[PDB]
Structures are given as C-alpha cells and as structure tokens.
Amino acid sequence: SIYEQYLQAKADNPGKYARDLATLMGISEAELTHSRVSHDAKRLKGDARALLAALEAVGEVKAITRNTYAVHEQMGRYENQHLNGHAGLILNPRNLDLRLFLNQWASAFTLTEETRHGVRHSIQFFDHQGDALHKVYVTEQTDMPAWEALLAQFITTENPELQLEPATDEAVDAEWRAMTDVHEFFQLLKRNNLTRQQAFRAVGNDLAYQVDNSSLTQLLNIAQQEQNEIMIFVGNRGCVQIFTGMIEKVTPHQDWINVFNQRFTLHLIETTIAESWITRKPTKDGFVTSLELFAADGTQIAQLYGQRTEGQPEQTQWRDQIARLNNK
Numbered sequence: 236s237i238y239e240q241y242l243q244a245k246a247d248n249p250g251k252y253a254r255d256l257a258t259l260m261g262i263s264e265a266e267l268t269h270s271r272v273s274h275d276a277k278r279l280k281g282d283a284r285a286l287l288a289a290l291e292a293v294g295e296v297k298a299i300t301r302n303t304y305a306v307h308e309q310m311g312r313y314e315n316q317h318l319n320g321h322a323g324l325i326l327n328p329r330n331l332d333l334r335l336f337l338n339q340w341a342s343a344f345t346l347t348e349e350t351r352h353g354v355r356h357s358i359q360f361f362d363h364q365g366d367a368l369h370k371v372y373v374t375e376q377t378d379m380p381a382w383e384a385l386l387a388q389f390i391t392t393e394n395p396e397l398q399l400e401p402a403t404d405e406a407v408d409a410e411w412r413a414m415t416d417v418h419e420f421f422q423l424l425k426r427n428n429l430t431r432q433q434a435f436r437a438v439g440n441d442l443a444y445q446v447d448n449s450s451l452t453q454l455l456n457i458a459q460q461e462q463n464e465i466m467i468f469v470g471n472r473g474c475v476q477i478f479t480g481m482i483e484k485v486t487p488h489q490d491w492i493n494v495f496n497q498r499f500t501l502h503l504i505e506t507t508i509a510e511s512w513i514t515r516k517p518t519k520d521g522f523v524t525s526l527e528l529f530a531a532d533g534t535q536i537a538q539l540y541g542q543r544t545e546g547q548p549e550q551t552q553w554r555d556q557i558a559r560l561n562n563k
C-alpha cells in the first residue's frame with residue numbers, strides 16, 4: 236500500500252533518505268516506517284526507557300540525532316543512564332552524551348534494510364508528531380548476540396496504528412538574570428510562553444545579541460586551529476546529543492558544513508542558518524556563553540559552548556573566540 240508508494244518514490248529519488256521520502260509522500264517518517272513493517276521493519280514495544288536501558292548490553296553503536304538542518308552522528312555506548320524522570324540522561328562526556336525529553340517518545344521500530352550502500356540494522360524512535368527522535372545503528376563492534384537478544388524481547392507481532400498529534404520584556408529580562416543555572420532556561424521559556432528567539436529579542440543585548448551568519452564557520456575553524464575543547468549540541472523535540480572535544484577537521488561542501496572527527500560527525504546545512512545569536516546565561520561558576528543557530532522557521536539548528544566542568548568557570552579561550560565574531 237503506502238509501502239508501494241515508498242518503493243516507487245525511492246526508485247525515483249536515489250539521493251534521498253527516508254526522512255526526505257516521507258515528506259515527498261506527504262507523511263511522517265513514523266508513518267512511513269509503520270508501512271515498512273513486515274517488509275524491512277518490525278514494530279517494537281513502545282517503551283523508550285526499557286529499550287534504552289536494554290541498549291546498554293549491546294556495546295558499541297552509532298547514534299544519530301538530528302533535526303531538519305543538522306545531523307549529529309556519534310560512536311559510543313548507552314551507559315551511565317539516568318532516566319527516572321521526564322528529563323533523562325545518558326551521561327558520557329566526550330562519548331555518547333544524550334539529554335532526553337522522554338514524554339515525547341512515542342514509537343519504536345527496528346529495521347534491517349538494503350540501502351545503496353549495504354545492509355544496515357537499526358532501532359528507530361519517533362515522537363508524537365511522527366518525527367524521528369533518535370536512531371541507533373549496528374556497527375562492526377556491536378555485540379550481535381546481545382542486539383539479537385534485545386530484539387527478540389522487544390519485537391511485537393502487532394503493529395497498531397500510530398496515534399499522532401499536533402509578558403514584558405523587562406520582566407523576562409529580570410527572570411533571565413535571576414537564573415542560577417542554565418538548566419532553568421526551559422522553565423523560563425515555558426512560563427512566559429516564549430520561543431528561544433522571542434526571549435532573545437525581549438531581553439537586553441548584553442544577554443543575547445545577533446552575529447553574522449558566518450559565525451559558525453568562523454568559530455569551528457578557530458577551534459580547529461587552536462585545539463581547545465568545545466561542545467556541539469544538536470537536537471530536536473525529544474532528544475539532544477552533545478559532542479565534547481577538539482575539532483579535528485572541518486570541511487565545507489556546497490550548502491553544507493561538516494565536522495569529521497574519529498568518532499563524531501556533524502553534517503549541518505550552513506545555508507539554512509537564518510539567525511545567529513550569542514547568549515549568556517548565569518551559573519554558579521559564572522556566565523556561560525553560547526552560539527545559537529536558527530532556521531527561518533524558528534528551529535534551533537545547533538548550539539555551541541566551550542567545554543566546562545562543574546566548579547570551573549567558562550573557558551577563557553572560548554570567551555576570546557566568541558569575542559572575535561562580528562555583530563549584526
């Protein structure tokens with residue numbers, strides 16, 4: 236059925252990934268994946284936490300989190316998990332470091348597909364809107380018997396239909412200044428019913444200011460030359476993946492900017508950066524500064540920070556690097 240369209244669409248669009256085909260087909264990626272069940276996909280029990288916890292057993296994998304404009308690929312292990320809440324963590328600085336908003340995790344599937352590049356095995360998680368949250372791919376280092384055993388436990392014969400779904404500047408400013416830690420920002424936005432960009436515009440320019448759209452490239456190239464550790468956050472509504480480390484290679488390619496490290500890859504569509512902001516948020520160890528990028532539709536494409544550990548102030552080198560960017 237819809238599977239038949241997918242096959243045709245795929246035939247007709249070889250350089251497009253599932254996410255792109257789904258859009259072409261007028262449907263969510265989750266709905267597309269649901270249609271592939273019995274063909275090259277199987278439905279898994281929709282228990283994010285159980286699946287996540289179980290992944291600790293498989294060892295090395297390739298984790299992918301993305302939004303429309305950026306893709307973050309990290310090699311690592313689902314260890315050091317802390318999921319007893321809506322805000323979950325997989326805490327591995329410099330390796331697989333995830334921040335999870337578990338209330339957004341709706342469905343899960345497993346695929347074994349033939350691609351233009353070979354056979355890939357994965358587990359894919361989708362949100363309530365049917366968008367991809369997170370993907371886990373098998374690698375040469377994955378513990379296969381453990382992966383196979385996890386699937387045996389989580390695969391379900393049933394494939395139920397998916398239940399998809401759809402004031403003052405001065406005060407905002409004072410609330411932002413009153414924060415004691417960055418993590419309080421989400422509640423800040425929630426209580427004033429604001430988007431990140433809307434809050435940025437409301438507050439003082441010392442707290443949030445615009446820089447040129449070329450700022451990302453400038454920053455990545457500066458970090459690559461200086462070899463200071465930085466952090467790159469790429470996320471979506473239910474998941475944020477964080478790279479921490481030195482930038483080994485940055486390479487632009489047409490509309491893209493890429494970071495190629497041994498165990499991390501960033502693919503970002505530079506040309507979609509519509510607004511670039513520098514923001515500063517308070518913490519017990521002082522202010523922390525980040526570069527935040529947004530697409531025309533308001534999507535946060537990515538965000539950068541300098542490496543930091545609790546009880547240490549913001550990196551000086553980072554602060555100096557940000558200082559070299561051009562306003563406007």
Ligand code: HEM
Pocket residue numbers: 322323324334335336417418420468475516518523525540543544
């Ligand atoms: C408790 C262990 C955690 C550690 C050690 C940690 C570490 C960090 C660090 C170093 C930063 C950069 C800002 C700074 O230097 O302070 C940051 C920001 C951030 N964290 Fe955490 N984090 C933790 C928990 C969480 C959790 C549970 C979530 C969500 C589930 C989360 C989501 C984020 C987000 C989205 C940012 C960017 C903040 C912004 O500027 O909007 N973190 N974290």
